[PDB]
Amino acid sequence: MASRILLNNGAKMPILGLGTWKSPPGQVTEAVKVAIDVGYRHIDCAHVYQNENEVGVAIQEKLREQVVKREELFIVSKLWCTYHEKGLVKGACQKTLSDLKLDYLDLYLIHWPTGFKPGKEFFPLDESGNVVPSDTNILDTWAAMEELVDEGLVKAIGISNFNHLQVEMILNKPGLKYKPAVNQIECHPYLTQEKLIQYCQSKGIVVTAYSPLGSPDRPWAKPEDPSLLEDPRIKAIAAKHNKTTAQVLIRFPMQRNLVVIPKSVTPERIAENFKVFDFELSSQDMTTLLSYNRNWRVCALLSCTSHKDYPFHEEF
Numbered sequence: 030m031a032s033r034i035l036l037n038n039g040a041k042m043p044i045l046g047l048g049t050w051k052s053p054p055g056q057v058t059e060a061v062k063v064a065i066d067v068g069y070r071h072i073d074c075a076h077v078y079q080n081e082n083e084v085g086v087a088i089q090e091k092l093r094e095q096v097v098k099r100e101e102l103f104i105v106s107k108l109w110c111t112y113h114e115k116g117l118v119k120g121a122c123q124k125t126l127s128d129l130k131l132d133y134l135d136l137y138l139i140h141w142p143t144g145f146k147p148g149k150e151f152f153p154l155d156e157s158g159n160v161v162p163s164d165t166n167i168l169d170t171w172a173a174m175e176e177l178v179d180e181g182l183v184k185a186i187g188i189s190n191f192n193h194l195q196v197e198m199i200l201n202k203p204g205l206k207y208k209p210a211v212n213q214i215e216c217h218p219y220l221t222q223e224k225l226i227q228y229c230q231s232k233g234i235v236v237t238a239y240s241p242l243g244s245p246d247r248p249w250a251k252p253e254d255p256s257l258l259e260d261p262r263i264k265a266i267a268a269k270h271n272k273t274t275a276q277v278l279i280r281f282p283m284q285r286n287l288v289v290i291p292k293s294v295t296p297e298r299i300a301e302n303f304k305v306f307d308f309e310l311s312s313q314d315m316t317t318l319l320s321y322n323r324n325w326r327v328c329a330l331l332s333c334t335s336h337k338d339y340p341f342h343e344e345f
C-alpha cells in the first residue's frame with residue numbers, strides 16, 4: 030500500500046484524507062491541526078459545509094510552523110450547486126481560496142451535477158418546497174471549471190455524485206480540454222458501487238469514497254437504519270485482524286484502488302483512522318465485505334429528485 034495514487038493530470042493524490050462535513054467550526058481547526066500532525070496530507074472541504082475559514086486557519090498554522098510544505102498538502106474543495114453559472118464559478122473558487130488561505134487548490138469538484146438558482150440560499154425553494162433549478166447545463170459548468178485550471182487557481186478538476194451517463198456526457202463533451210481527474214461518490218459495504226467504479230477506473234478517473242463509515246452523524250439518521258460500525262459481521266473481520274471496525278472500513282476502499290476520506294473531530298479517532306497502512310484484508314475478506322451491498326445511501330439529495338440532472342434514478 031503506496032500512500033498516493035497518480036491522477037490523469039500527472040499529480041499524485043494521497044489515498045487517505047480527512048473529511049470535514051459536519052465538523053463544527055469551533056472543533057475543526059484543532060481536528061485539521063491534529064490530522065496534519067499525525068500524517069494526513071489530504072483534506073476534503075466544501076463551501077456548503079460552512080467551515081472553510083476554520084479549516085484554513087489550521088492549514089495556515091501548520092504551513093507557518095513548517096510542519097508541512099504546501100507542495101506536500103493536497104487540498105480539495107467543491108463548487109456548490111448555486112454557482113454553476115459561467116459568470117459565478119471563478120468568484121466561488123476565489124472565495125473558497127480566500128477562506129482556506131490558499132493561492133491554489135489541488136482539486137476542485139463540481140459538488141453535484143444539479144445546478145440551482147443563484148442567490149444567498151444554498152437550497153432555493155419554490156413556495157411548495159421543490160428546488161428551483163438553474164438552466165445552465167453541466168457541460169458549460171465544466172468549461173468554466175477548465176478555465177480555473179488555465180488561470181492557475183486549481184491544479185485539477187473533477188466531479189462528485191455523477192452517474193455513469195453523466196460522466197460519459199463530460200467525457201464525450203465537444204471540445205473537452207481536461208478530463209475529470211476524480212469522481213467523488215458515496216461508497217461503503219452497504220453501497221459498493223461496483224459498476225460505476227469499474228466505469229470510472231476504466232477511463233483513468235480516480236474514485237474517492239465518501240461516507241466510508243456510513244456517516245453515523247448524518248442529520249437525517251433513523252435508528253431503524255443499517256449501521257456499519259455496529260454490524261457484527263464487520264466487527265468479526267476487524268477482530269480477526271486485531272483492528273477496529275473503522276480501520277477495516279477505511280482499508281476496504283484502499284484495496285479497491287480508491288481514495289477514502291473518513292471524517293472525525295475526535296483526536297484519538299483521527300490518529301486511529303490513519304493507522305491502516307500496516308495490515309491487509311484478504312481477497313476473501315474483500316469479497317465478503319462486497320457481499321453486504323444493499324444499495325443504501327446516506328446522501329440521496331431528496332429535495333432534488335425532479336431536477337433534470339438528479340443522479341440517482343439511474344442504475345448507476
Ligand SMILES: NC(=O)c1ccc[n+]([C@@H]2O[C@H](COP(=O)([O-])OP(=O)(O)OC[C@H]3O[C@@H](n4cnc5c(N)ncnc54)[C@H](OP(=O)(O)O)[C@@H]3O)[C@@H](O)[C@H]2O)c1
Nearest residue numbers: 048049050239240241242243244246275291292293294295
Ligand atoms: N461529495 C459529497 O457530496 C459528500 C457527501 C458526504 C460526505 N462527503 C465527504 O466525505 C467525508 C466523510 O463522510 P461523512 O462525514 O458522511 O461520514 P463518515 O466519515 O462515514 O463518518 C463520520 C462519523 O464517524 C465517526 N467516526 C470517525 N472515526 C470513527 C472511529 N474510528 N470510530 C467510531 N466512530 C468514528 C465520526 O465521529 P466524530 O467526528 O465525533 O469522531 C462521525 O460521526 C465528509 O466529511 C465529506 O468530507 C462528501
